[PDB]
Amino acid sequence: AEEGALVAAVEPGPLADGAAVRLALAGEGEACPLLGSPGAG
Amino acid sequence: AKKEHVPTWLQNTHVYSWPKNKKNILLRLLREEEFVAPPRGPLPTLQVVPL
C-alpha cells in the first residue's frame, strides 16, 4: 500500500525585507565665548 | 595712664598718647586726617573680548 502518504518540504512563504534607519545631525558650528577685563596699576 | 582710665563713653572715640601722638592732636584740632585717600578715578573698562 505504497500510496499511503508523501513527503513534504516546508518553506516560509511571505518573506519580507527592509532597510535600517540611521540618525544623523544636520550642520555644525561653534560660536566663540567672551572673556577678559584689564588689570590696573 | 592706661586704657581703663578713659571713661567708657569716650573710649568709643579716638584716644591719643602724649607726647607720642601730639602731632595727631594738632591735626585733629585742625580737623585734618594724618592720612588722606587719593581721589577716585573712573570705573575700569569692561573689556570683554572673544576667545
mmCIF file with all atom_site columns, N, CA, C and O in Angstrom, chain A residues 32-38 40, chain B residues 44-51:
data_model
loop_
_atom_site.group_PDB
_atom_site.id
_atom_site.type_symbol
_atom_site.label_atom_id
_atom_site.label_alt_id
_atom_site.label_comp_id
_atom_site.label_asym_id
_atom_site.label_entity_id
_atom_site.label_seq_id
_atom_site.pdbx_PDB_ins_code
_atom_site.Cartn_x
_atom_site.Cartn_y
_atom_site.Cartn_z
_atom_site.occupancy
_atom_site.B_iso_or_equiv
_atom_site.pdbx_formal_charge
_atom_site.auth_seq_id
_atom_site.auth_comp_id
_atom_site.auth_asym_id
_atom_site.auth_atom_id
_atom_site.pdbx_PDB_model_num
ATOM 1  N N  . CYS A 1 32 ? 31.967 81.634  19.366 1.00 0.00 ? 32 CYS A N  1
ATOM 2  C CA . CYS A 1 32 ? 33.019 81.836  20.351 1.00 0.00 ? 32 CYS A CA 1
ATOM 3  C C  . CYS A 1 32 ? 32.450 82.480  21.615 1.00 0.00 ? 32 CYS A C  1
ATOM 4  O O  . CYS A 1 32 ? 31.516 83.285  21.538 1.00 0.00 ? 32 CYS A O  1
ATOM 5  N N  . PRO A 1 33 ? 32.984 82.151  22.788 1.00 0.00 ? 33 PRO A N  1
ATOM 6  C CA . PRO A 1 33 ? 32.596 82.861  24.010 1.00 0.00 ? 33 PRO A CA 1
ATOM 7  C C  . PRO A 1 33 ? 33.421 84.129  24.190 1.00 0.00 ? 33 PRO A C  1
ATOM 8  O O  . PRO A 1 33 ? 34.369 84.400  23.453 1.00 0.00 ? 33 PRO A O  1
ATOM 9  N N  . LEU A 1 34 ? 33.043 84.910  25.199 1.00 0.00 ? 34 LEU A N  1
ATOM 10 C CA . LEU A 1 34 ? 33.717 86.159  25.518 1.00 0.00 ? 34 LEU A CA 1
ATOM 11 C C  . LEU A 1 34 ? 34.326 86.077  26.909 1.00 0.00 ? 34 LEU A C  1
ATOM 12 O O  . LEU A 1 34 ? 33.801 85.400  27.797 1.00 0.00 ? 34 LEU A O  1
ATOM 13 N N  . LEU A 1 35 ? 35.446 86.777  27.089 1.00 0.00 ? 35 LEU A N  1
ATOM 14 C CA . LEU A 1 35 ? 36.185 86.727  28.340 1.00 0.00 ? 35 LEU A CA 1
ATOM 15 C C  . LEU A 1 35 ? 37.078 87.952  28.459 1.00 0.00 ? 35 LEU A C  1
ATOM 16 O O  . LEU A 1 35 ? 37.406 88.601  27.463 1.00 0.00 ? 35 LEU A O  1
ATOM 17 N N  . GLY A 1 36 ? 37.458 88.265  29.693 1.00 0.00 ? 36 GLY A N  1
ATOM 18 C CA . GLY A 1 36 ? 38.570 89.152  29.962 1.00 0.00 ? 36 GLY A CA 1
ATOM 19 C C  . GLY A 1 36 ? 38.141 90.529  30.436 1.00 0.00 ? 36 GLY A C  1
ATOM 20 O O  . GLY A 1 36 ? 37.058 91.035  30.128 1.00 0.00 ? 36 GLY A O  1
ATOM 21 N N  . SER A 1 37 ? 39.035 91.129  31.213 1.00 0.00 ? 37 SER A N  1
ATOM 22 C CA . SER A 1 37 ? 38.950 92.521  31.629 1.00 0.00 ? 37 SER A CA 1
ATOM 23 C C  . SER A 1 37 ? 40.352 92.974  32.032 1.00 0.00 ? 37 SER A C  1
ATOM 24 O O  . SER A 1 37 ? 41.155 92.159  32.496 1.00 0.00 ? 37 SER A O  1
ATOM 25 N N  . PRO A 1 38 ? 40.664 94.257  31.866 1.00 0.00 ? 38 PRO A N  1
ATOM 26 C CA . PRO A 1 38 ? 42.048 94.703  32.051 1.00 0.00 ? 38 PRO A CA 1
ATOM 27 C C  . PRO A 1 38 ? 42.431 94.835  33.516 1.00 0.00 ? 38 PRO A C  1
ATOM 28 O O  . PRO A 1 38 ? 41.611 95.183  34.368 1.00 0.00 ? 38 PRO A O  1
ATOM 29 N N  . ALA A 1 40 ? 44.951 96.741  36.435 1.00 0.00 ? 40 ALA A N  1
ATOM 30 C CA . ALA A 1 40 ? 45.255 98.136  36.711 1.00 0.00 ? 40 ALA A CA 1
ATOM 31 C C  . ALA A 1 40 ? 46.465 98.225  37.629 1.00 0.00 ? 40 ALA A C  1
ATOM 32 O O  . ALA A 1 40 ? 46.848 97.254  38.285 1.00 0.00 ? 40 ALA A O  1
ATOM 33 N N  . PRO B 2 44 ? 36.733 100.790 35.833 1.00 0.00 ? 44 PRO B N  1
ATOM 34 C CA . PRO B 2 44 ? 37.572 100.149 34.816 1.00 0.00 ? 44 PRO B CA 1
ATOM 35 C C  . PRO B 2 44 ? 36.769 99.783  33.582 1.00 0.00 ? 44 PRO B C  1
ATOM 36 O O  . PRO B 2 44 ? 35.560 99.543  33.644 1.00 0.00 ? 44 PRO B O  1
ATOM 37 N N  . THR B 2 45 ? 37.459 99.744  32.447 1.00 0.00 ? 45 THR B N  1
ATOM 38 C CA . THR B 2 45 ? 36.818 99.393  31.187 1.00 0.00 ? 45 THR B CA 1
ATOM 39 C C  . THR B 2 45 ? 36.458 97.913  31.187 1.00 0.00 ? 45 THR B C  1
ATOM 40 O O  . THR B 2 45 ? 37.324 97.057  31.398 1.00 0.00 ? 45 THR B O  1
ATOM 41 N N  . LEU B 2 46 ? 35.184 97.610  30.946 1.00 0.00 ? 46 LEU B N  1
ATOM 42 C CA . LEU B 2 46 ? 34.739 96.226  30.859 1.00 0.00 ? 46 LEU B CA 1
ATOM 43 C C  . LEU B 2 46 ? 35.155 95.644  29.515 1.00 0.00 ? 46 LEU B C  1
ATOM 44 O O  . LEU B 2 46 ? 34.315 95.420  28.638 1.00 0.00 ? 46 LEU B O  1
ATOM 45 N N  . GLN B 2 47 ? 36.454 95.399  29.347 1.00 0.00 ? 47 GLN B N  1
ATOM 46 C CA . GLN B 2 47 ? 36.996 94.983  28.060 1.00 0.00 ? 47 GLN B CA 1
ATOM 47 C C  . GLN B 2 47 ? 36.783 93.492  27.834 1.00 0.00 ? 47 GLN B C  1
ATOM 48 O O  . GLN B 2 47 ? 37.747 92.722  27.771 1.00 0.00 ? 47 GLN B O  1
ATOM 49 N N  . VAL B 2 48 ? 35.525 93.077  27.713 1.00 0.00 ? 48 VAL B N  1
ATOM 50 C CA . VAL B 2 48 ? 35.216 91.679  27.438 1.00 0.00 ? 48 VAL B CA 1
ATOM 51 C C  . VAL B 2 48 ? 35.403 91.426  25.947 1.00 0.00 ? 48 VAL B C  1
ATOM 52 O O  . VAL B 2 48 ? 34.802 92.107  25.106 1.00 0.00 ? 48 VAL B O  1
ATOM 53 N N  . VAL B 2 49 ? 36.238 90.444  25.614 1.00 0.00 ? 49 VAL B N  1
ATOM 54 C CA . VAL B 2 49 ? 36.586 90.170  24.219 1.00 0.00 ? 49 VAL B CA 1
ATOM 55 C C  . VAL B 2 49 ? 36.449 88.684  23.949 1.00 0.00 ? 49 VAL B C  1
ATOM 56 O O  . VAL B 2 49 ? 36.570 87.847  24.854 1.00 0.00 ? 49 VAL B O  1
ATOM 57 N N  . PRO B 2 50 ? 36.199 88.325  22.692 1.00 0.00 ? 50 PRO B N  1
ATOM 58 C CA . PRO B 2 50 ? 36.012 86.910  22.358 1.00 0.00 ? 50 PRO B CA 1
ATOM 59 C C  . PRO B 2 50 ? 37.303 86.117  22.480 1.00 0.00 ? 50 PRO B C  1
ATOM 60 O O  . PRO B 2 50 ? 38.407 86.660  22.399 1.00 0.00 ? 50 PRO B O  1
ATOM 61 N N  . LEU B 2 51 ? 37.146 84.813  22.681 1.00 0.00 ? 51 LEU B N  1
ATOM 62 C CA . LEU B 2 51 ? 38.279 83.897  22.718 1.00 0.00 ? 51 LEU B CA 1
ATOM 63 C C  . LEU B 2 51 ? 38.492 83.269  21.346 1.00 0.00 ? 51 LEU B C  1
ATOM 64 O O  . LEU B 2 51 ? 37.540 83.041  20.599 1.00 0.00 ? 51 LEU B O  1
#
